[PDB]
Amino acid sequence: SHMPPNRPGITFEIGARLEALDYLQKWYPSRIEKIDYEEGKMLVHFERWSHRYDEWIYWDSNRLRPLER
């Protein structure tokens, strides 16, 4: 088990915020809910929405983008 590779503007830690594309192809402010280090993916929670919408997204996915800062 190894750490997620570095990506600009994203911190791969629980509770860290970012923006993510949901399955309906729209971007939302989101937070990292869980990290699966073996599979290289994380469970993304879309802020304001039910946790039933949380999605597993691989840590290298272009469905993730950092917040503009």
Ligand SMILES: CN1CC=C(c2ccc(O)cc2)CC1
């Ligand atoms: C993170 N995604 C946000 C919005 C969702 C949604 C919006 C409208 C609708 O009819 C059905 C689903 C899905 C979860």
